[PDB]
Symmetry: D2
């Protein structure tokens, strides 16, 4: 039925916990009585995403309340909502839509874990976990907290944690040398570039499912342009906390998982002001966003090629930037490979 | 029974309407249970505001994370919210905080209608109505549907209806020549001030009972300063529709109330960009926001010592501004003196 | 000699100083020996204007050394310059191409005072002063150092003398009453507009002959819009010293002339930033640049009606705007009506 | 006579012609009468630097008119000028000082030359050439026209010659391989940095005597930051034409001198908008100005650690940058090792 160490089990389930996946669709106010996990789909969410963009060009170009209104109505039709007896919010405030973008985004992954799990259960193998874990196509290699590799990972978390995120705290618990389904032959031609470094990348536990079926993806095409500060692409941080801030956990759930991986940054194009990048300047490969504080460069290990900014993040010279901390964004899925997949508690400050 | 011309009665009961008030609070995601309508308090609200003002300051300074945490919990608790099955919408985005600034503004009058309501269950000289009528300390004397005034007033409504404001059609149902007791007395000084014209003012119907009672009021000190495009004051539009857009009358409640008052402006301070200010430049008595559309002035009829921009919408010749229509914002509750109240029906083309 | 008040004569002996003309040109580095005073022409200078304009819509719009080099040539050949053994300045520094604008302006005026100065002023009856007077086609009368009028002027002068302009002390020598032949008939329409004030206007003395003959003109079309802060129009001030800084007086020539005209402002367009107006917004009849300082408003007095801003300088509530002091620009020449022409002597601190 | 190859003999005499020195002094209107070479002085020029920056602070911090006038006086009273019969320019244009930064910069070297040229003149043996050659304390050797290096340097020129610089062609009259005494080891410590490359530097001929004897240096402490775009440092280009322009040659004086040095940039703090740097963001070594057009990135030609941008100039993604071409700044003089010296003729068609 099984064999995976306890920590692996406490994981394989979280990934397919069809229960939570519901409490999540609920959080976004969905009428789970017309839009259940069973009738989800990329191609549908995609239509949702597209409606959202036809609303960005709406306000911007200045559109008749009629048009603004129609749009908002279609969106709430192709994506049912359960408000109760309260007036359905408006979608013409940029902030309003962005809220929806975040929503539609966290959804994408969900459609996977289910449709991906709504089958494959026939050849009587082992306990439910094995039949799923197997389809992960990800050798969830195990790591020891008292050997070598992990030894370093310890340092990372501890230091890369911002002073402005003192609303909770971390506590290393599980390290697992995750290894995708041959994403190796993919990230190899992307060695031809300097700048190999391990950065974070947090998310919602309900998401870490498809993050393995076909790793970190970039906002599909139909996504709104002004949806991201540096455009549609994979985002990374050299500050654990900041990336943790993307786990979204409450007092009754101080236990989400994070991830660590290296990207082929090559020659990074660093901005200090928001820009919805479409094409990289010729010669450039990635984009860095200079924040007001940064892992002290004076100190930071490395090896095997990759680099690690694990120095008491101090204040950089940049002082006309909008960001508070750094950001790294590459625009080619094949320009990244996942190495380790942590997980720790968030014991807040209620 | 009653001694108010039929229409004036349908009005008394409409604004002093029991059920609607509760119908209005629920939709705001308020938990009637823990938040009993008969428990609203003038100070209980001003306490809420200040929480918001602190929530937007620290957010516009990327301060700490233990600010939104604590501050968010507090608010939702002071003002009992029943998200039912949804997750408490953190007020971090510094955007959903505005929708909150709004609600309170509303709650303010709701709170006044009630108190004012619950205070005359004693003597019984006439129908409940007439009793609640002597409470608005105002003279609501109907206007002869067929006369100059109606013609003027009605033509005003029709002419300054803006195009981009398509989704609803307007049709005057009845005009009321209101006269708040004493308003005439404090407005007296300001009539020696040049530049005073009839502008519009919309609002939810459950706020009128308190408006006719204590008149138009600025946001309290406690409320944020970045809550209103041009600071805390009494707003006015010269575009009927624009001001009607603030009645929030839906398919279910197709009729709202619009207020026509006389404003002592004088030396206006032009602006094309939103600028949250707390004071006027020397020699400045009001602030005027420039819209790309405005009433043609060559048609500014002068109701004896008062102007009326009944001039059909036209191009102002300004274009680098961020307003599609004008706004007038006074900062002394005395510079105002309401003259007309009107009932209208909204014909939606959704 | 002549039946003209001694004073009126000295004013004439002033404006009609030919030698002082060449002096100007010289200070500009012009080659009199190639461009003799008697060789000036309006089309020349005008055609010179377009070159500067052509540099604008070229220089900053991205250019080629060849062009700037070429256009700079076309310019310097068209208008001779003597720099001696020193490679002549190349037009492409904005501040550089800008002086040429300040240069050309002063030039267009010299030519007018010149062609006028000699067109038929050598008759029997009376001498030159008398003959050249009538050329001015403007009544000129003396005002007494005791007339309520003079007391207003003097008051207006000393009170509105800015504080940054501390490099000289003023002293009114001879006040004069004037009236251009047929300007009243030209100002009659606007004579019935609102907001009329006594604003200043400073100019180089050897320009007056043309002004008292042609009235204050607008920089010809062919001038780059960018060569002027608020588009091409007439400029006035409420700080005597702001327009006085334009009389181009040295110690050699410490006595200058300044104007007090009646301008029909109407609806001003309150701008605090700079823009190169080409068209005006509806209803607008002028533009008023906002400055950090301004005359005290409650100090405004009135002479014959016209609001005169003789109120001691005050800090305005508009601090961010570019201008340190106010400005007024009208774009139709008929909105101005010269009344008083002063004759004051600077006391320098150079 | 001199035992040095004639070509070298020409450069020594050229960069020591006391006449072309004076031609310089006059180029700036400097009064040679009351301000002759022999009277120049390190202390003097420096003191004017302080004044020059006084004009900066006082101008960007405001003040009044009387002060601006006094500082200029103090400047001219220090460095005598002869403005013929023109109006003595006023320094306040915030860039009218820039032209003075240039002057004072030149004056320092011009002064140096003269000083070296007199500390060892009354000697006897060979032509004063070998006498001045040794004073430079820098080995100079001719690079054979058909020397492999020659084909590379020339390639660089013809390739990195900007298209907007079409007001002159370029021909390499001479190529030199110089080696300043001492500079080989004060640079050694920076030979460990990364991104060491060949970059251009163009300056005045009368300026080279000191440059070879003191090496390229950064503006003094007294000197004002406002005089430079990215602060006091040593600048470089990768577009020979860009550096060419700084040789200030004319149809009269067509021959100029430009340098090729290998700068140790390391980790560049890349900007794209004018900024007067003070501190260099941690981890940053140099500064890079981004240009709209740039030497083809995939054409780089490395020479052991030292990269060479000889690729034709094409376009880079950057479009919001304020620059037309790249730029390079190091804020430590020891971070630059001079290598070659070209003597080239310009070819204008004017
Ligand atoms: N993923 C990270 O750890 C992460 C690190 C750093 C910056 C990020 N900026 C935006 C987002 C982001 C998160 C969720 C969604 Cl839906 C869109 C963008 N993530 C980020
Ligand atoms: N209501 C009007 O007639 C009105 C007219 C013009 C401008 C306004 N700007 C802001 C608000 C406003 C609306 C809702 C809330 Cl809660 C606060 C302010 N109202 C306005
Ligand atoms: N003329 C005034 O008295 C005067 C008053 C007020 C503002 C002005 N702004 C610019 C110029 C101005 C002056 C000379 C040149 Cl050549 C161009 C513009 N004059 C002004
Ligand atoms: N030297 C170059 O070829 C050169 C290349 C690139 C940028 C430069 N920016 C400023 C200056 C500069 C140097 C001295 C002075 Cl006085 C003024 C400007 N030179 C530069």
């Amino acid at each position: 039925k099984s064999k995976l160490p306890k920590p692996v089990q406490d994981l394989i389930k979280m990934i397919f916990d069809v229960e939570s996946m519901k409490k999540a669709m609920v959080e976004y106010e969905i009428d789970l009585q017309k839009m259940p996990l069973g009738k989800l789909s990329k191609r549908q969410i995609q239509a949702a995403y597209s409606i959202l963009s036809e609303v960005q060009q709406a306000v911007s170009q200045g559109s008749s309340d009629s048009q603004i209104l129609d749009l908002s109505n279609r969106f709430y039709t192709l994506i049912p909502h359960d408000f109760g007896m309260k007036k359905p919010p408006l979608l013409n405030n940029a902030d309003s839509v962005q809220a929806k973008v975040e929503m539609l985004d966290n959804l994408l992954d969900i459609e996977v874990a289910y449709s991906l799990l709504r089958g494959g259960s026939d050849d009587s193998s082992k306990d439910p976990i094995d039949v799923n874990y197997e389809k992960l196509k990800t050798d969830i290699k195990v790591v020891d907290r008292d050997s070598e590799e992990a030894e370093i990972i310890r340092k990372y978390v501890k230091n890369t944690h911002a002073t402005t995120h003192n609303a909770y705290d971390l506590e290393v618990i599980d390290i697992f040398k995750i290894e995708r389904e041959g994403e190796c032959q993919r990230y190899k031609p992307f060695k031809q570039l300097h700048n190999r470094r391990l950065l974070w990348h947090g998310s919602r536990t309900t998401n870490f499912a498809g993050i393995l079926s076909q790793g970190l993806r970039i906002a599909p095409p139909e996504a709104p342009v002004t949806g991201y500060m540096f455009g549609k692409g994979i985002y990374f941080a050299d500050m654990v906390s900041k990336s943790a801030n993307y786990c979204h956990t409450s007092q009754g759930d101080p236990i989400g998982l994070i991830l660590l991986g290296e990207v082929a940054l090559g020659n990074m194009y660093e901005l200090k002001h928001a820009s919805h990048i479409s094409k990289l300047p010729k010669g450039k490969h990635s984009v860095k966003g200079l924040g007001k504080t940064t892992p002290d460069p004076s100190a930071n290990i490395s090896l095997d090629g990759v680099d690690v900014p694990l120095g008491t993040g101090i204040s950089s010279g940049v002082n006309d930037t909008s960001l508070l901390y750094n950001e790294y964004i590459v625009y080619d899925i094949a320009q990244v490979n996942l190495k380790y997949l942590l997980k720790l508690k968030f014991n807040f400050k209620t």
